């Protein structure tokens, strides 16, 4: 239901940031901030027509759209190279493959999964930009719809990222026989 709008945004923003700098610069300056902060008064032009019809849903759209426009040029040059995973799976694929610190990522994942709606938006942007600093393939539509469902109970989106992260870690380790 929301995932479809999520794929719309990710579609035109994924081609937008690479195809013209005005929106990428109007969105980049909105990472990790409220949808009404004056600094983001220039991002409505692009994001406002896609929100459907609680504030958690709009927070999700604006926040992740900004995240998509604030990634380094390396991550976009690889992002434009041409069931499905959450970002937890992305963290495991990051530690197992690109050599990140396991004992750290685990406590940063449980640190973020243990917070309130506002803590996921303040702690999230640097974490995801670090993951795109290591160019791990993160899925954006799932990330936003997840943040959208992050506002009704702080249990139904955290537990699945943590369990999905550990699950894929031990499957990547058992598969390395």
């Amino acid at each position: 239901y929301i995932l479809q709008h999520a794929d719309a945004l990710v579609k035109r923003v994924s081609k937008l940031i690479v195809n013209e700098p005005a929106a990428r610069a109007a969105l980049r300056r909105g990472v990790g901030l409220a949808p009404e902060d004056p600094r983001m008064l220039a991002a409505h032009r692009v994001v406002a027509p896609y929100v459907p019809v609680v504030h958690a849903v709009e927070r999700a759209f604006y926040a992740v759209a900004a995240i998509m426009a604030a990634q380094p040029r390396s991550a976009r040059d690889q992002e434009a190279e041409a069931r499905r995973p959450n970002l937890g799976v992305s963290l495991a694929q990051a530690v197992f493959d690109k050599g990140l610190n396991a004992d750290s990522t685990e406590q940063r994942l449980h640190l973020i999964a243990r917070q309130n709606l506002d803590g996921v938006h303040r702690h999230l942007p640097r974490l995801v930009l670090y993951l795109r600093s290591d160019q791990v393939h993160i899925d954006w539509g799932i990330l936003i719809r997840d943040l959208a469902r992050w506002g009704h109970t702080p249990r139904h989106v955290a537990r699945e990222w943590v369990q999905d992260y550990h699950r894929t870690l031990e499957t990547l380790t058992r598969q390395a026989e």
Partner: protein, 366 residues
């Protein structure tokens, strides 16, 4: 016979005691998140300050074998004779095979499983009882699995040696229910009076020496901090404290020093880089002869801001103490000090001049 103490203390942007991941501990009270300082942290600061003045050193530890062996090595015993000696003192107190120990890591003396709570002269006397049986201990070390040889009666009477901190805070020891002393001070957790969210600080420890081509920080991370106006509360059951201490003058000194340490002290959690030391902006001591009472329900409805919180917290504690006083009438004593002369708080009793004056006149009236 219950000395209740309330205090409003506003701590600036800091992090007193973090959680298992750095964040400050938070309660969900009246529906909203509220940073809090655990009770055990303040209790620890209090005891270390009280015992600081009253140099009793109520050491809580596990390595009693290590220090008993150290005391025996100071008094002439050989290293192995001291180690086996201490192990005899600890192994002669449980039911059989002594108290339970843990896996010995190094060749160093092992650490017991339970936490002991004794003063330093108590450990010294334990080393004395161990010294009274030099030959016996040496004879037991010759075997492969030695047993208890010490007169469990007197060592068990030495473990029961109390202290000011032992008297107030109490002790627990499962393998020796005869030494368990019950605490006399009910210490409560300190929660904010207004919903406060945590805030992330981004820090980068940069390396001083440059690198050939590029220059980046040595390490980047982010720690969680929070500021706010904490409410704190504690009870002192005089009756049980005088029962533990026995005398009434020592008890009176212990409660007076307790209150002064309760207002004065502040924990040592990430203070070396935050300088969050402060004093309570409001202090309310009441002496009740029926039951202790906390003002926590007054602060259930979180306070919205954009204004200050000290005045609102002060006058709201006043309001709740007034109506609460006229709903549960009792012949109790009430006194308060305040660091803000704008409003006049009537229901809190007679406004003394200063914290130590307030404490002196209230402990006296008790």
């Amino acid at each position: 016979t219950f000395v209740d103490i309330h205090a409003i203390q506003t701590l600036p942007y800091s992090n007193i005691n973090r959680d298992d991941l750095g964040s400050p501990k938070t309660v969900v009270y009246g529906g909203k998140e509220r940073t809090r300082v655990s009770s055990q942290s303040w209790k620890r600061a209090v005891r270390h300050e009280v015992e600081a003045r009253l140099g009793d050193k109520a050491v809580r530890t596990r390595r009693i074998i290590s220090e008993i062996a150290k005391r025996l090595r100071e008094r002439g015993w050989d290293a192995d004779l001291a180690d086996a000696g201490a192990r005899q003192v600890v192994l002669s107190v449980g039911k059989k095979s002594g108290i339970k120990l843990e896996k010995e890591k190094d060749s160093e003396a092992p650490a017991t499983s339970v936490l002991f709570y004794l003063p330093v002269p108590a450990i010294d006397e334990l080393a004395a009882i161990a010294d009274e049986h030099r030959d016996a201990v040496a004879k037991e070390a010759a075997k492969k699995t030695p047993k208890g040889i010490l007169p469990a009666d007197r060592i068990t009477e030495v473990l029961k040696s109390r202290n000011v901190s032992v008297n107030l805070f109490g002790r627990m020891l499962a393998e020796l229910p005869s030494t368990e002393v019950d605490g006399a001070v009910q210490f409560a957790h300190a929660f904010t009076v207004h919903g406060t969210t945590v805030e992330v600080d981004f820090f980068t420890a940069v390396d001083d020496i440059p690198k050939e081509n590029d220059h980046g920080s040595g390490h980047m991370n982010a720690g969680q901090f929070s500021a706010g106006t904490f409410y704190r509360y504690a009870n002192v059951n005089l009756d049980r404290l005088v029962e533990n201490t026995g005398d009434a003058q020592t008890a009176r000194t212990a409660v007076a020093e307790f209150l002064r340490a309760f207002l004065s002290t502040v924990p040592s959690g990430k203070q070396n880089a935050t300088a969050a030391m402060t004093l309570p902006d409001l202090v309310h001591i009441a002496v009740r002869f029926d039951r202790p009472i906390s003002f926590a329900p007054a602060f259930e409805t979180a306070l919205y801001g954009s204004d200050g919180y000290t005045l609102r917290a002060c006058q709201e504690l006043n309001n709740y103490a007034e109506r609460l006083r006229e709903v549960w009438p009792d012949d109790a004593i009430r006194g308060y000090a305040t660091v803000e002369n704008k409003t006049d708080l009537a229901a809190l009793g007679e406004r003394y001049d200063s914290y130590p004056a307030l404490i002196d006149a209230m402990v006296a009236a008790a």
